[PDB]
Write a protein that binds this DNA or RNA. Sequence first.
RNA 1: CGCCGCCAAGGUAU
Lengths: 55, 170, 261, 52, 175, 167, 278
Amino acid sequence: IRDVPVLYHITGAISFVNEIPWVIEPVYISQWGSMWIMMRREKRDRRHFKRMRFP
Amino acid sequence: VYKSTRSAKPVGPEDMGATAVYELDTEKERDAQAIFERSQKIQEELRGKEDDKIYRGINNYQRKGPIRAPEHLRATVRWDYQPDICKDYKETGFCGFGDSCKFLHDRSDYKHGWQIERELDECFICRQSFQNPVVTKCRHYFCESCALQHFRTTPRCYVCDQQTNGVFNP
Amino acid sequence: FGTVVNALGKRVKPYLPQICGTVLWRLNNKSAKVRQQAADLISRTAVVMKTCQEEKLMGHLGVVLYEYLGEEYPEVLGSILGALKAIVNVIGMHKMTPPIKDLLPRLTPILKNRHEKVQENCIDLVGRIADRGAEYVSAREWMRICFELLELLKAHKKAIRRATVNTFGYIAKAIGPHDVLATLLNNLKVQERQNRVCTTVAIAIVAETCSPFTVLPALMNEYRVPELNVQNGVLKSLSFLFEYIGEMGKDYIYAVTPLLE
Amino acid sequence: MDFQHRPGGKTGSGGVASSSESNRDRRERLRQLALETIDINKDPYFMKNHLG
Amino acid sequence: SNIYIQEPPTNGKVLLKTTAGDIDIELWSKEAPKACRNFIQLCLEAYYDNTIFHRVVPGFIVQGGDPTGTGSGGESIYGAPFKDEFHSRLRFNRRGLVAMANAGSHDNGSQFFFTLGRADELNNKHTIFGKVTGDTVYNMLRLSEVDIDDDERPHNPHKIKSCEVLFNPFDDIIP
Amino acid sequence: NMLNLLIHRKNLNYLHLDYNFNLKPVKTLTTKERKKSRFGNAFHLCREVLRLTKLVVDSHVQYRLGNVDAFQLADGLQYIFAHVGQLTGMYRYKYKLMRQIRMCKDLKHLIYYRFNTGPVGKGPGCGFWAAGWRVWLFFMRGITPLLERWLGNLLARQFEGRHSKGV
Amino acid sequence: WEKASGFEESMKWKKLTNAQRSGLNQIPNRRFTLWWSPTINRANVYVGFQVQLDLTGIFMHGKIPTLKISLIQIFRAHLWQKIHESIVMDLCQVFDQELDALEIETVQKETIHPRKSYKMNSSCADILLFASYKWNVSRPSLLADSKDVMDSTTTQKYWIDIQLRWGDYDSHDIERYARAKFLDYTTDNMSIYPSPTGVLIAIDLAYNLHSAYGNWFPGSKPLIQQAMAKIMKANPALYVLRERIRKGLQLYSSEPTEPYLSSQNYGELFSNQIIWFV
RNA sequence: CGCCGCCAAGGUAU
Ligand SMILES: O=P(O)(O)O[C@H]1[C@H](OP(=O)(O)O)[C@H](OP(=O)(O)O)[C@H](OP(=O)(O)O)[C@@H](OP(=O)(O)O)[C@H]1OP(=O)(O)O
Ligand SMILES: [Mg+2]
Ligand SMILES: [Zn+2]
């Protein structure tokens, strides 16, 4: 879900999300590599794929 | 009556449309890109063979063309209501540009789409009962004694003063 | 072919789809001037198909000849207009699939063609519409074509010039003799003949088709304009007026006697 | 198409007439020309009649 | 594809047999808990036996759920009528929908109605809690005959003979 | 609620701005209402970037409806971040992002031809989306003050009127 | 090709004020754009924003004004709905033979609803067939097959609706277009169909050919195959659109006699389907 | 050793 802080207006004008991402790089590269391997193994084990119906 | 199947599964798919296939054109294994891929592949395999005359099909004697549609996509449709009509040729009969005007030269003043849209959304003389209702020469249904007293008043009719000429009938 | 189909009549019934298919294929033919024969053949076969109980194919070819009149050849366009003329003659006008609501506005750019056969067939169909279909307009078209019917004059056949005055008369019968009248009086300063006498006859026809005393006060008034041609035009219009009315001039002799003196 | 460097025209014009209205306006313009030249030259004997 | 069904997914399905045929009503139990709860409870009590359809407005509505047949008899299993439960994705843009019949404020019981078309005047006024699986919607389109004799109540109204429960979440008891 | 209320304030009532952020006339516009209602780059480019984030948030809420898994959303918003121009029309009123589209369209091959090494499969499933994500963050990172200033000038031109012969 | 008054010695001595004298002629620039129409308007290079005009279904994949003007002269005056009404009049008149099937009581033409002919998101039925009892329909299938297993629900009525489209060189396979469209409208919830059974007929105007996808009772398929081949052979609206293309495109034949086309089986052999002789 | 991928004002007057 990624719960997140926000900074919004009283009347509901605009809701600024106020958070800088702040990720450390070796755990970042390892997470992307882990999901790379899992997603290669997921596409290898799928019979055929249909993407989104993008609207 | 339409009997049911007696199942707990709902009416359709589980994704509720998240895998629309868009199979309006020729499908995947029969499309011309797939035919070109098969032809290219079999031209890559048979190389040491020199006219083996099993002939393999039509195009194999020795991705362009009909390109495959994106299956994962609807085209974003818009209603182009705005026509290009020579108004000075439509309602008047003479365009000042002649044949150099870019528009249509149309003169059919029929309804547009939006007009269809906002049209689809929505006796008598004495004033008594007919004591023997009887006629004259000219359809005038009168009474008996009332028209006798009327002839005693004036020898003509009452509605349009027609010459009765002593002619009074039922 | 017309005499053969007129002698046949009902007996040509298992032949009309083949002949009309031959015509509908024939109507392109390289555009090497073999297209007026097919349209003239339609104009001949217009009579025999009504007497053979065939109106569905009439409705088929009416919307074909409705837009095969976008030609550049005048010799083909005249035969197309003659075929459409024969369609309007043999069929009742209010029950045709090219209705008058969108047919006469397609006839109006054809009116600006200076070929004599195109002009003849066009203004004959316009006269047929003007005396039998004057309710299919917005009342503005008969006023904007009568100015173009002034430029329709000076055509040297005498059939165009005798049909166009009848078209003026039925235009004025349709939309009243008070607006085309000023057009016919403004056609009296031309310097050219065959354009001032051919509107003199039009003044006579607007005088004689609809009732009198609608054209006579302005015709008396135009003599006050100090020009030679308008005075000669109003005098010759009085000549054709009394020539066309005859016995109805018993009340107007005392009114135009101070003009004739 | 070059919409800026084409021979243009205004909408709802109607065009220009045939020979009849053109030489009618030509004769009226020559009439006005003759009247203004006799107005400058001050000729009291030039007179127009009841028929032009 | 571009059809865009435009509705949340369903949960729970019941079968309902009338003389007009079989109707498989599938409910939105998540988007409307109390109305679907009352509906499955009254189906499990066999409460809709001998219940007739007492109002037919052809093209607009066909009403049921009245054991008396007058248009005012409605008894929930709550003791009191319950609240309105609305949803922005559940509107009256089509036919085949089921909604609790209401008379103004929060007054909903056994009295409900099937839809027969576009019902934009009923938006934000009634609680949509279910639809009908297609290939069976014509068994309730046979309910709309012009035999009404009045604004409602035709000659021979169709009655519900049985009400089966195909799927039953949030387990309940008949009292 | 702001891109429709601009139209509602400017007294148009014929441009049907929809939720998926497009724009459609309805009434076959005459000259006095065509020239009043056409927008420049500040309205339209904001409309396309809001349509882009609208498709992104629609993808995320489609995931959290509960009928599609994580790999399918990965390939989905990878296609979204890699194939703008095909489905958003954002290049139409700002051409400089077109090269960035090419900058996406190139790097996808760096992704897509490294799934296919070995017995993996030719079909879709390319769900490595961070690379197009970084460059379309780099777009808005430099374009935010630009069309911020453009929409500020738009609000000035709308609310306090124009200056005809001032500057 | 174009021969009618090309040189044009003396046109008719008009005035030729400014633009009709010196400006360029727009009609060759629009008939040439009309001539390469499916490969200037192809659907699958940019598959995004498409802009269909009023009353038509071209969808215009591109912002090309010249092609839009050249395609509206051949969809000029309500002839889309005229093709609609004409072919539904043909395939309701051809069902006057009622006893050759099991039994057909009436063939109801429903309420004539405008905007139906080009509404692509929603649809309704066009005509309806009633019965007394139990029409045994089949599984939904095409018209290019011959199996006809016929094991489905016995139903009462049977709706028939027609569809229209336009070419575009990348999607001309209406055996799949009709199937996908019938699946979309039988999974749609906006439908006001009288049955989920009846056939959806799709005909392809540019590259003109015909198909359908639905279920079939025994007196339906081989009747209406030849009956709609007769519609493709003889139809006023679907031929005046052809001669309107001819008047907007200047195509002409150069033969003295008719090019061997008749009611013979030779003539549909070359309709880009594969037919063998044995 | 493998360019290139396009919107609008310009016209149906005010
Ligand atoms: O046609 P290619 O030059 O061979 O490249 C295609 C193409 O990518 P590009 O056109 O951007 O280079 C496809 O994307 P589309 O533009 O056709 O939408 C892409 O598919 P994805 O959209 O999933 O990325 C994938 O084609 P495929 O569908 O087979 O995966 C890909 O490379 P390949 O055709 O060699 O696989
Ligand atoms: Mg200008
Ligand atoms: Zn023009």
